Symmetry: C3
Amino acid sequence: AKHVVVIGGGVGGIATAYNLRNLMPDLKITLISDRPYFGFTPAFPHLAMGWRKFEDISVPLAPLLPKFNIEFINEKAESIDPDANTVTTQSGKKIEYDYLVIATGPKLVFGAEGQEENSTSICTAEHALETQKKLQELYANPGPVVIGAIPGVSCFGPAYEFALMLHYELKKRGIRYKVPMTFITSEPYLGHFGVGGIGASKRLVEDLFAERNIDWIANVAVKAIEPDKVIYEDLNGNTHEVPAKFTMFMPSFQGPEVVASAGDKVANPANKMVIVNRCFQNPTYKNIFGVGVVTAIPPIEKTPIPTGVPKTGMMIEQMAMAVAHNIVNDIRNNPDKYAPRLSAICIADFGEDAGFFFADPVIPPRERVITKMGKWAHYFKTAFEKYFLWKVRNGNIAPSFEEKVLEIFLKVHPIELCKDCEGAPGSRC
Amino acid sequence: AKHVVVIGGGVGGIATAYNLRNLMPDLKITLISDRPYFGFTPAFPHLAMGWRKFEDISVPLAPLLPKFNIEFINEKAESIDPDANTVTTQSGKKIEYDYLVIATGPKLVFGAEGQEENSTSICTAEHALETQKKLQELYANPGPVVIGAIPGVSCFGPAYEFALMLHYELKKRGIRYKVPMTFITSEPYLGHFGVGGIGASKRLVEDLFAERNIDWIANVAVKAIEPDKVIYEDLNGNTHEVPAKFTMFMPSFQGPEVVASAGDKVANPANKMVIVNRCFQNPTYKNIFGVGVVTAIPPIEKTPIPTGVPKTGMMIEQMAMAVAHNIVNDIRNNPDKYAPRLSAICIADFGEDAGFFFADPVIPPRERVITKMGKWAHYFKTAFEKYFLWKVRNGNIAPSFEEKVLEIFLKVHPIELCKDCEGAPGSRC
Amino acid sequence: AKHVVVIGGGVGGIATAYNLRNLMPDLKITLISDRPYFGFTPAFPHLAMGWRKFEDISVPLAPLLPKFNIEFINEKAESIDPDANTVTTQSGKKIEYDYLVIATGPKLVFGAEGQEENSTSICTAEHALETQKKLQELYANPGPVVIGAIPGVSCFGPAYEFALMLHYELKKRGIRYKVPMTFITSEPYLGHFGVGGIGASKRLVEDLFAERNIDWIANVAVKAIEPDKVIYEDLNGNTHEVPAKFTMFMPSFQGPEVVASAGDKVANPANKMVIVNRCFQNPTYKNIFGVGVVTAIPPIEKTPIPTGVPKTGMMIEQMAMAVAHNIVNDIRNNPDKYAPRLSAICIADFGEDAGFFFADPVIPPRERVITKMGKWAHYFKTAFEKYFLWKVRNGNIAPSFEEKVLEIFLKVHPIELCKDCEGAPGSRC
Ligand SMILES: Cc1cc2nc3c(=O)[nH]c(=O)nc-3n(C[C@H](O)[C@H](O)[C@H](O)COP(=O)(O)OP(=O)(O)OC[C@H]3O[C@@H](n4cnc5c(N)ncnc54)[C@H](O)[C@@H]3O)c2cc1CS
Ligand SMILES: Cc1cc2nc3c(=O)[nH]c(=O)nc-3n(C[C@H](O)[C@H](O)[C@H](O)COP(=O)(O)OP(=O)(O)OC[C@H]3O[C@@H](n4cnc5c(N)ncnc54)[C@H](O)[C@@H]3O)c2cc1CS
Ligand SMILES: Cc1cc2nc3c(=O)[nH]c(=O)nc-3n(C[C@H](O)[C@H](O)[C@H](O)COP(=O)(O)OP(=O)(O)OC[C@H]3O[C@@H](n4cnc5c(N)ncnc54)[C@H](O)[C@@H]3O)c2cc1CS
Ligand SMILES: CCCCCCCCCCCCO[C@@H]1O[C@H](CO)[C@@H](O[C@H]2O[C@H](CO)[C@@H](O)[C@H](O)[C@H]2O)[C@H](O)[C@H]1O
Ligand SMILES: CCCCCCCCCCCCO[C@@H]1O[C@H](CO)[C@@H](O[C@H]2O[C@H](CO)[C@@H](O)[C@H](O)[C@H]2O)[C@H](O)[C@H]1O
Ligand SMILES: CCCCCCCCCCCCO[C@@H]1O[C@H](CO)[C@@H](O[C@H]2O[C@H](CO)[C@@H](O)[C@H](O)[C@H]2O)[C@H](O)[C@H]1O
Ligand SMILES: CC(C)=CCC/C(C)=C/CC/C(C)=C/Cc1c(C)n(O)c2ccccc2c1=O
Ligand SMILES: CC(C)=CCC/C(C)=C/CC/C(C)=C/Cc1c(C)n(O)c2ccccc2c1=O
Ligand SMILES: CC(C)=CCC/C(C)=C/CC/C(C)=C/Cc1c(C)n(O)c2ccccc2c1=O
């Protein structure tokens, strides 16, 4: 029985571990995670709004993973020795591996002066919770609201979802008229999402904001978040201020120190994310795989204010399906290799209703896109939450019917047989 | 009995006077106006188009106000002595006052050079009927038509109405293809309206115009209107001209000389409009109130070309309602003071169809907006006119059911209890 | 018998010749054409896509024309001597005329460097059949496609068609996601078509390109087309580059030499196109008339990158009716002159669906427009093709019913009685 160590107990890690397990019962699998729970991240904005209890959107891992014959180690992974094939945890426990899957997700950078002190974030359950405590003060004393993304940000979705969910909340409380709302993004235009748009997203989102009276400034670098104002800089280099009593800003992401310590064949020097090829396998150390946000994928377009590419839920689900297959195939001496399609369904919950975004694939050129908005989309996200948590709880992230439902509805094929894995992830075999 | 004097027989004046008489049957009211008729301004564009007889959209006041025990003075109020509590008329007749309501509407400034001479306006019924003559000449032998708003304009609606009405008319006599149409405006973008747009009004008006082949220039200053052309200036300081056989440009507004005649405590030095607080009361002379266009309200937005903020019929009806209660509460020694909501239902007639706008409030940030378009809206404009005229003739501008109706359909309340009057009108109390 | 000579076996020539035949059976008519067949130009993009066989979209003229007493000479008109009322052919045959109709269509100019040998065009049948061959080269070797219009272009429609149709095909073959697409135009914005847009056509095309992932660069000047790339130049004169495995660009138009061989009273000194008045008649030589693409019509607006006005089928077949009547009324001593209305009804085919455009007249100011999209519009283009070729084959381009159907469905009269022809073609009597 070969040994696969997975670092990181999130969407990517869980999915790779369950994929490997369901494809090969006679396989020793160890998962290492610094958090004792899997957290459902797409529900963090709602948690930040106080519309979710943490226990509803999390699954304790240590009592669960043994049920699927997976070893859970509840520590941080400190370093990787890819020559020795070894992972070292923080307490000093060394673990040998035959294959390694890195899935540590994003490491937050609050790159704006004062952002970490005077702003709020929704990227972790921990941050989402101290956001909730702060919104409490906004409702009590309605001042101006500023929301958005700093330079380097690569996950733009949640900030739109927060802006619009907050609008809804204030409007339910009959105080929206006491609260100006500005959205500031490093995107060249609204609805760029770090992907150069999804269909006519720029137009869909611009009307959404105009209809719901949400002022916006795009194509600018947010430099500072003071207790009382947000300072930013446009392409001429002049700085501007905007009054703000409450702010929520997306951090930019970088890779973790664990990856960094594997050397510059594994760790991308620029951002410390995991160097991978079309097959989400490391070029140099071919028993190392990266899955999820931590994977180094080049941007789709070099925008005037730096932006990066989002790794969304469905993309990662495909990454995990491809890496699991490629590991299994290597073990079984099958030369076949798979690249993930990297397509994305994306639902942005605006409170009462929601935006549906489908891009196939996400990195252009695209075969097709779907942009729709409705109440149905909001229910779909609540359903999907309930559904994903059940998958984590029942040992299968990729039940065969999900694949076929996605075929019938969207003509989506999650992974393809790759003829040549040498090349940037996202680039076409 | 206490003595209140209403200066001005327009929307605000009549509304305020009627509300007072209905709250307090035994209160003496004197209304002074320089016109023996009440002008229904919302129908003046149709009068310029020749779809109304002046007699149908006017109400003679002399035989009417004495029916509600309102003393009518058919003279111009010349000066105001606020320390001596007196108004002095054109013939020099001194009338003393306990309370003063100023509702003199706008003093028109034809601020582009050559505008009074070479252009038409639709602001007064005199100018409207004049415009009718010029349209006749136009139909006889077509030429370029340019319509719009100069710098300083705060009433954009009627220009949009007129452009689109004139379109429908030129088209219905098959002569449109021989008539270019350009709309040039001081608004930063189309459908800004001085209010920073209403929902996605900017997208909606740009589409209306493109469909109806109306050319447009926004964010420029009309500097000159000549017999043959219109000269305007963009933000670089560059001059451009546009050929024109017929022009109709909106003048800008300023306070009258009668207001100016009271100190710099009643008359806003920058524009001669009445200094009022949240409760539409003068900060220093507590027995002076302003209603309607005459009131100084800070612009919602400093736009690159100076624009002001409209005071719509519903906004004014609300002002008048708030002021009535404020005066009566003060007479009765009741500490309750009321702010108007300053929301707008605004219908722009386009000939056979029309655009329905609803802003709550008008001054951002907004609780909600409605922007719809259709036939029904045009018919609702004809029917509201008939309704409003009936209101003036029957001594109630504010019957109880009307408020309940607006509450049921739009969830609007015309007036709020104001915790503290001290602050700019429109600002949140 | 008077003798009318038509140069041009295309839409313009045929429709003038047929029209004259139906108005005057005893009139002598001679058609000079270098090509032995009428080509149904609107179906050339489909021919390039390989969805038509040449034989289906063309009519042999040599056997056909004698059936309507039209003498067909299959040679290229070489020179026109307006002082001798003659036309000399490539063999040397001098033909006299009492009236002349110039309808040679466009002489293609491949302005960009490398355009003629490296790009491909769809403007003639030979060029279109040649493009099919290169499209084969692409389907087997997926690479970047770029498509558009060079400076000075005037037929933008076929490029939009082609881009869209090509997208449809790439999707059919499942290779769309392996093939980027960029549309590069001299138009100031998308959907300008050299007409200052039709209705809200800019919003419409932009949105069309977004859903389908066709990138675009507008308001630039294409200067080079190399085997592996396209070089364009922006308004700052800064020179840019984009990769290209396959290209397809519209050439600009100029007048033929046969026109140039007459005075500069007949050939416009700037473009060699035929000088005509409102009545598509030459101001100097009153018995010379021009029909179709060869006619000199001023640009609707002076665009940052030069552009021209399209001459669409409906416009041309209206020139033909106007010119016809003008020759007939001269023969019959009727002082009456007609101008064509010049309204367009242009269906842009996209493969499985299509874009309906109606502009009446094409040249602003307009009486009305209709811009719509759907499957029906695609079945309408196929239907119209079958219908038009029937008209060619059956000898009447303007059946009475067709004008009455146009009247009651679009309120379209094809010609207007014109009190004064002296002026630019397309300007208003
Ligand atoms: C706020 C927010 C919302 C959000 N919403 C999404 C949505 O509505 N739809 C969607 O499709 N995607 C959404 N995403 C993005 C994406 O789905 C999420 O970021 C995923 O959660 C990312 O998955 P990953 O597997 O890449 O990372 P992870 O966050 O699930 O967690 C990885 C695990 O690794 C652990 N870990 C970190 N560092 C470690 C070290 N050194 N050693 C051991 N383990 C380590 C960590 O505990 C975690 O369990 C959305 C994204 C956001 C965020 S801003
Ligand atoms: C052309 C035009 C159309 C128009 N349409 C509107 C619409 O469709 N909907 C809407 O909500 N608002 C529209 N408005 C704006 C608004 O409704 C009008 O401007 C109101 O008429 C403004 O009300 P006011 O009471 O502020 O002004 P008034 O003009 O009705 O009455 C002023 C009265 O005062 C008299 N007066 C002036 N100076 C005096 C002195 N010194 N002494 C005594 N009396 C004086 C004056 O004669 C009049 O009776 C629309 C607005 C327009 C117009 S530009
Ligand atoms: C590729 C392409 C597509 C296209 N599609 C159109 C569409 O879908 N709808 C529409 O309304 N218009 C479309 N057009 C534009 C226009 O309708 C066409 O170009 C017409 O064919 C123009 O008609 P004309 O009569 O102006 O020209 P013609 O092309 O038919 O050719 C006239 C004839 O003259 C002959 N000829 C040239 N030189 C001669 C000399 N010296 N002597 C004698 N005869 C000569 C020539 O052989 C031809 O028989 C569309 C336009 C395009 C094109 S890029
Ligand atoms: C057990 C396996 C089954 C898994 C479930 C699979 C998901 C099923 C997909 C359902 C299709 C969703 O996509 C569907 O889109 C259309 C819009 O085009 C929406 O329909 C909407 O149409 C128009 C606006 O366009 C509205 O006037 C209408 O009120 C609304 O219903 C549907 O409400 C939505 O459901
Ligand atoms: C004593 C009671 C009398 C007081 C008056 C009470 C007010 C009455 C309410 C009026 C009804 C509202 O007006 C209604 O607006 C909706 C907006 O979705 C329109 O709904 C629809 O109309 C047509 C299609 O039918 C479209 O142009 C439009 O896109 C669409 O919104 C209705 O055509 C219109 O009739
Ligand atoms: C005997 C010779 C005479 C034959 C000529 C008859 C022509 C009749 C067509 C005139 C009608 C106008 O053109 C009409 O545009 C409307 C736009 O609302 C389309 O109306 C509709 O299109 C399709 C369904 O048909 C829908 O996707 C769309 O939502 C809807 O708008 C019609 O499909 C089209 O026919
Ligand atoms: C509107 C039309 C035509 C179709 C919609 C119906 C669809 C797409 C049904 C598929 C249901 C399904 C299992 C989707 C998979 C799905 C995945 C895999 N991820 O990762 C998500 C992440 C965030 C939000 C939503 C999703 C989501 O819906
Ligand atoms: C489409 C939806 C959801 C609702 C529409 C139904 C509505 C708005 C009903 C309200 C009817 C009503 C009594 C309106 C009062 C009303 C007022 C008070 N003013 O001042 C106007 C000024 C100009 C033009 C129109 C008006 C108008 O309609
Ligand atoms: C959508 C609406 C309101 C009406 C549909 C328009 C209809 C039914 C028009 C009548 C049909 C008809 C005989 C049109 C004549 C017609 C003409 C005269 N020309 O020149 C064309 C050129 C290119 C493509 C199509 C045409 C075309 O359809």
